[PDB]
Design a protein around this ligand. Sequence first.
Ligand SMILES: Nc1ncnc2c1ncn2[C@@H]1O[C@H](COP(=O)(O)OP(=O)(O)OC[C@H]2O[C@@H](O)[C@H](O)[C@@H]2O)[C@@H](O)[C@H]1O
Ligand SMILES: Nc1ncnc2c1ncn2[C@@H]1O[C@H](COP(=O)(O)OP(=O)(O)OC[C@H]2O[C@@H](O)[C@H](O)[C@@H]2O)[C@@H](O)[C@H]1O
Ligand SMILES: Nc1ncnc2c1ncn2[C@@H]1O[C@H](COP(=O)(O)OP(=O)(O)OC[C@H]2O[C@@H](O)[C@H](O)[C@@H]2O)[C@@H](O)[C@H]1O
Ligand SMILES: Nc1ncnc2c1ncn2[C@@H]1O[C@H](COP(=O)(O)OP(=O)(O)OC[C@H]2O[C@@H](O)[C@H](O)[C@@H]2O)[C@@H](O)[C@H]1O
Ligand SMILES: [Mg+2]
Ligand SMILES: [Mg+2]
Ligand SMILES: [Mg+2]
Ligand SMILES: [Mg+2]
Lengths: 277, 277, 277, 277
Amino acid sequence: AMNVPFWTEEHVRATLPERDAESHKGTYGTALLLAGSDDMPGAALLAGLGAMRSGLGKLVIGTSENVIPLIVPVLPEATYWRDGWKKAADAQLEETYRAIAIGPGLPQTESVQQAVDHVLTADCPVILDAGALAKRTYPKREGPVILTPHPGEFFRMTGVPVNELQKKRAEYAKEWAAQLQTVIVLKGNQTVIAFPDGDCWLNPTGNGALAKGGTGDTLTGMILGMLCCHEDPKHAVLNAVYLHGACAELWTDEHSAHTLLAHELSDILPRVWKRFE
Amino acid sequence: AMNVPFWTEEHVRATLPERDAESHKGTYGTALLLAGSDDMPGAALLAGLGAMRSGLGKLVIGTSENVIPLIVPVLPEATYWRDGWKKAADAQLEETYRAIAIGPGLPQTESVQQAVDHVLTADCPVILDAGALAKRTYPKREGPVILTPHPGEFFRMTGVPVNELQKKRAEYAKEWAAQLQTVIVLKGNQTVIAFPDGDCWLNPTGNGALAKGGTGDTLTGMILGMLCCHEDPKHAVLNAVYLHGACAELWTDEHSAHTLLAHELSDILPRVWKRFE
Amino acid sequence: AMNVPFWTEEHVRATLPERDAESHKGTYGTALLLAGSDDMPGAALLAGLGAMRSGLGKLVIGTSENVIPLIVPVLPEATYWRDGWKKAADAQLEETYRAIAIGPGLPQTESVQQAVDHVLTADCPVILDAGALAKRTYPKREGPVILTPHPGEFFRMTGVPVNELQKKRAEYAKEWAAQLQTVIVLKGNQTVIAFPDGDCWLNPTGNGALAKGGTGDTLTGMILGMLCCHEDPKHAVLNAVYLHGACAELWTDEHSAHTLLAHELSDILPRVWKRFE
Amino acid sequence: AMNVPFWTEEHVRATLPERDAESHKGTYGTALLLAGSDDMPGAALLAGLGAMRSGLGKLVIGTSENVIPLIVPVLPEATYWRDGWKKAADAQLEETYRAIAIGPGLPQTESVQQAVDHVLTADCPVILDAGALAKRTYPKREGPVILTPHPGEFFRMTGVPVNELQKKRAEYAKEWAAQLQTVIVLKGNQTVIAFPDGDCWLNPTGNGALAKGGTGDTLTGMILGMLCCHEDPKHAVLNAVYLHGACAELWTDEHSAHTLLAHELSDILPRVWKRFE
Ligand SMILES: Nc1ncnc2c1ncn2[C@@H]1O[C@H](COP(=O)(O)OP(=O)(O)OC[C@H]2O[C@@H](O)[C@H](O)[C@@H]2O)[C@@H](O)[C@H]1O
Ligand SMILES: Nc1ncnc2c1ncn2[C@@H]1O[C@H](COP(=O)(O)OP(=O)(O)OC[C@H]2O[C@@H](O)[C@H](O)[C@@H]2O)[C@@H](O)[C@H]1O
Ligand SMILES: Nc1ncnc2c1ncn2[C@@H]1O[C@H](COP(=O)(O)OP(=O)(O)OC[C@H]2O[C@@H](O)[C@H](O)[C@@H]2O)[C@@H](O)[C@H]1O
Ligand SMILES: Nc1ncnc2c1ncn2[C@@H]1O[C@H](COP(=O)(O)OP(=O)(O)OC[C@H]2O[C@@H](O)[C@H](O)[C@@H]2O)[C@@H](O)[C@H]1O
Ligand SMILES: [Mg+2]
Ligand SMILES: [Mg+2]
Ligand SMILES: [Mg+2]
Ligand SMILES: [Mg+2]
C-alpha cells in the first residue's frame, strides 16, 4: 500500500563490511547481551550464538548465574557479567560497549525496565526485544534504539490489536517508529524495518521454517553482532534481518520447513554470508 | 490375519501439512511435554528434540528442576515449567496447549497418574507413554488420548502376556483401543496404529536400528509435534510413526543398524521429511 | 615368535551379528557400566558412547552422582544407577544384566575391588579396566572375565616390568590369561587378545592416532556393547578390538593421526561397521 | 624492516613429527593446562580442545571446580586437577609434565603470579598467556618460557604503548625476547615469533576471521600440545602458530570471515594438519 521497497540482495552486497587482514578484535568491538533467566535460559544461548556469529570482536553475556553453565560448552568464546541484567537495574554501565541488546528470555517486569533505562544512558546502539518490550517512551540519546516486536509485542507496546496491525503492517510500524523515535523491526513474513527518520524497508527473505520458538532470539543476536561490524547501524539491522531469512531459505532446499531449530540458523549463516561477499 | 492395511508413502504424501509463508508460530501451537526425572533425565531431551523437530510452534517442557540444565545446551528453543509433571499432580492446567505428552522418563507412580488425570481435563490431544502407562480407564473428553506401549507396557495395561500378544498384535491392539476408547500405537516391527473408532493401520517403515533405548521417547515427541501441525490428529500419529521408521531406514543405507543412537533420528528427520513433500 | 594369528577382516565379516527386523531391544540386552568419578568423569561418557554405539539394547550407567549431568546431553539414551559403582561395593547386584563393565575413571582402591567382587557373582561376562585392574585372583564363575590392561596396568597386575613385557607381549599375555583364567586384551600396537583356554590372536588394525587419553575407555564400552549383540563373547571381544582400530585407520585417511579425539571413534564406528556387513 | 623471514610451508612440512605405529601415549607426554575461572570459564575449554587436538598423549586441566563440568561433555578425554591453578599458588608441582600452559581465563592477580613462579620450577617448557602475563622477570631454568601477548598485553608487560609497538613489531618483540630471555609470540596479522637466542620469524598464515574472542586461548592449547609431540620446542611454537592461521584460511574458502567461532579452529585442524604431512 505504501510501496515500501525491499532490502534486496544488491543492497546487502553493497553494504556488508570487509574483515581486513590488518584488523584486530577491537576494530569489531565488544557487545553486551543482557538475556536469559532461570525458566527461559535458552534465549541467552540463541542470542549469544547469533551475536558471535555475526562479526563482533568480543561478547559479554550478562545472564543469570544459573544460565552461565548452559552456555559455555556451546559458546565458550563468550565471557560473562554474572547476574548482569539484574545488576543493570541498579546502576549505570561502567564499561563501554559497541552495542547492547536486552530482553531475550527476560521477564516483562519493572526491574527489566529499570535495566533498560540504565542501558540507554550508554552512547551506543541498543536493541530491545522480548521481555524488554513495553508500552513506554524513550529518551533523546546518541545511538539508535532498535525494537524488535512480533505482532503480539507490538500490541503490548502500542495498543494496536494484532488483527488490525496485520492489515496495515508497514503503516503502523512507520507511524510508531516516528512516534517513539526508535527503529522498529516488526516481525513476520515480509518483516518491516522502520526507521525514525521515515526510511522504511521490507525484508524479502525467509519462510515458515522461522515460525517456531527461538528464531527471534537468534535474530536479536545477529543484529547485535552486525551493529559491531557495520559502520552504519541501519545497514547492520537490514543485513541481519535479510541474512537471517536467507538462512531459512537455504535450510528448506534440502530440509522440511517444519523441522528447523533456531540455533541452526547460526550454523548456516557462515556459508550464507559467504555467498553475499 | 485381519488384513490391516499399511499406512503407505502415498498416504503420507497426501496428508503431510504445508508450512505457509503467511504462517506464524501460533498457527502451529504450543505443546507441553511432561517428561524426565532425576534418574531417567534423558527421555525429556529425546522427546523434546523429537517434538521441536516435528512442526510445532513452541514447546514447554515440564520436567524436574535438575533435568532442565541437561536439555538447554542441546535444545535451547524449549522453555520450561519448573517441576511441571509434579505440579500437574496437584491442579488443572491453567494454560492452553495444542497437544500434551506425558510419561517419558517418569516413574510408574500414582502421582504420575494424578498428573494424567489433570492433563485429561484439557481439551487437546494427549499422549501417554512410558511411566504414564498403567492399567486404568479414561474419561469421555473431546480430544484423543494416544497410548504408546511397547509389548511389556501393553501387558501392564491389559494383562495380555507378551508371548500371547505377539501372536495376534493387531487383534489385541484393536480390541483394547475399542475397550479403552484410546488410540493405541503398539510398538514393534510393523507397529500397529489402532483407533477407537475401529480404523487400524500397520506401519511399514523401520528396522532393528530402532531396537535400542530412547527411540520410543523420540517417537513420543515426534507425535507431539505432528499433532500441532496436522489438522487431523489421526494423520499426525500415522505420519509420526511412519517418518520415525523412515529415519532408521535412511540411517542403515550407510551405517550399521547396530550403531544408531535415538537422538540421531531427530537429526535425520529434516531430510527424510523433505523427501515426502 | 609364537606365530599368533591375526583376527582378520574375513573373521570379522563371518562373525558380526545381524540385527533382524523381528528383534526388540531385549534381544540385545541391558548392559551395566560402572565408571566415572569426580576427577575422572569423562571415562564414563567415553565408555557409555562406545557401549551404546555397539549394538546393545539398553545401558545403565552406575556413575557418581555429579557425573550423571555430564553424560546426559551427549548420550541421553542411557539411564542411571545413582552412585552405582560405590553402591556395588556394598551388595550383590539385584538386577540381571547381559554384560557388565567396571573401572574406567575409577580410582585404584579397595572399595572398587569390593565392587568387582560383587559384580563377579552375576552370571554374565564382566570387563575389568583401569581402576578395577589390580594384582588379584578371580573366582570360578560361568561368564568370562575380560581384563583390558595397557602395559603399565599389566605390570601392576603381574609384576612383569613394562620393558620386559614388551619384548614378549603375546607370551606374557597368554601365560597370565592361563594363570588367572581370564581373557586378557593387552593393549598396544598389535593388541594381544589372549583367552584362558589358550586361544590367542593379534589385532591387525589401528595406528598411533589411538595413542592418546580416552581411547581405551572407548574400547571398554565397545566390548561391553558387542558382548550384548554377539552370541559368542570371544567374537565380541575380537570384533570390538578390530573395529576400534579400524576407526582410527578411517580417521587417518583424511585427518592427521596427531589430532583424533577418542569420542570420535564412536562417531566413526557406524560407517566402519557397515563396511564389514 | 629487519627482514624477518616467514616460517613457510616448506619449514612446516620438514619439521612436523610422525606418529609411529610403535608409539604409545607416554611417547607424547602429559600436558598440564592451568586455565579457566568462574567468569571466564570458556578459555579452559578452548585451550583444552586446542591442546588435545595437537598431538599430546594426555591432558590434565587444573581449573576451578565449577568449570570442570563445562568441559567434560565436549572434551571427555581430559582429566582434572581440581582447583589446580589456585593450588599451584601454594606449592611446587609434584607430578612431572611434558609441558605446562598457564593463564587463559585467569585473572591478572598476584596469586596467578605465585602459581607462575611455582610452575617455573618444573623442568619443562612453559607457556604464559592472558592473565599470567605481567610486567616481571624470569628465572634461569632449563626449559623455554613462551609468552603469548596480544599488543595490549605487550604494553602491560613492557610499557611500550600499542600505537608505538605496532610500528615496529618485530624490533620490539626481538628486543624484549632478548631482555626477558623468553620466547615471545606477539599476536596480530603477521604474528612475530621471537626467540631469546635472537632467532625470529613471522607467521604467514591467518586472516581477520581470527580477530574475535577465544582464538588466542585456542592457540595457547595448540602450542601446548605441539610442545608434547615435537622434539624441538621452537618448531612446536612455529608450527602451532602456522597451522592455527592455516585453519582460519581454510574456513574462509567457503565461510565468511566474520562468522568463525574459535572452537571451530580445533575442528578444522585435523584436516589442515593432514595436508602438511
Ligand atoms: N512465515 C514466516 N516467514 C518469514 N519469517 C518468519 C515467519 N514466521 C516467523 N518469521 C520470523 O521468525 C522470527 C520470530 O521471532 P519471534 O516471534 O521473536 O520468536 P522468539 O521470540 O524467538 O520465539 C518465541 C519464544 O520461544 C522461545 O524459544 C523464545 O525464547 C521465545 O520465548 C522473526 O524473525 C519473524 O519475522
Ligand atoms: N525391529 C524393529 N523394527 C522396527 N521398529 C522397531 C524395532 N524394534 C523397535 N522398534 C521401534 O523402536 C521404538 C521402541 O520404543 P520403546 O520400546 O518405547 O523404547 P524407549 O522407551 O525409548 O527405550 C527404552 C528405555 O531406554 C531409555 O533410553 C528410555 O528412556 C527407556 O527407559 C518403537 O517405535 C518401536 O516400534
Ligand atoms: N600405536 C598404536 N597402534 C594401535 N593402537 C594403539 C596405539 N597406541 C595405543 N593404541 C590403543 O589405544 C588404546 C589405549 O587405551 P588405554 O591405554 O586404556 O587409554 P585410556 O585409559 O583410555 O587413556 C588414558 C587416560 O586418559 C584419560 O582420557 C582416560 O580416562 C585414562 O585415565 C588401546 O586400545 C591401545 O591398543
Ligand atoms: N587480522 C588477523 N590476521 C591474522 N591473525 C589474527 C588477526 N587478528 C587476530 N589474529 C590472531 O588471533 C589470535 C588472537 O588471540 P588473543 O588476542 O589472545 O584472543 P583471545 O585472548 O583468545 O580472546 C580475547 C578474549 O575473548 C575471550 O573469548 C577470551 O577468553 C579472551 O578473554 C592471535 O593468534 C592473533 O595473531
Ligand atoms: Mg521474540
Ligand atoms: Mg518406551
Ligand atoms: Mg586405560
Ligand atoms: Mg588472549
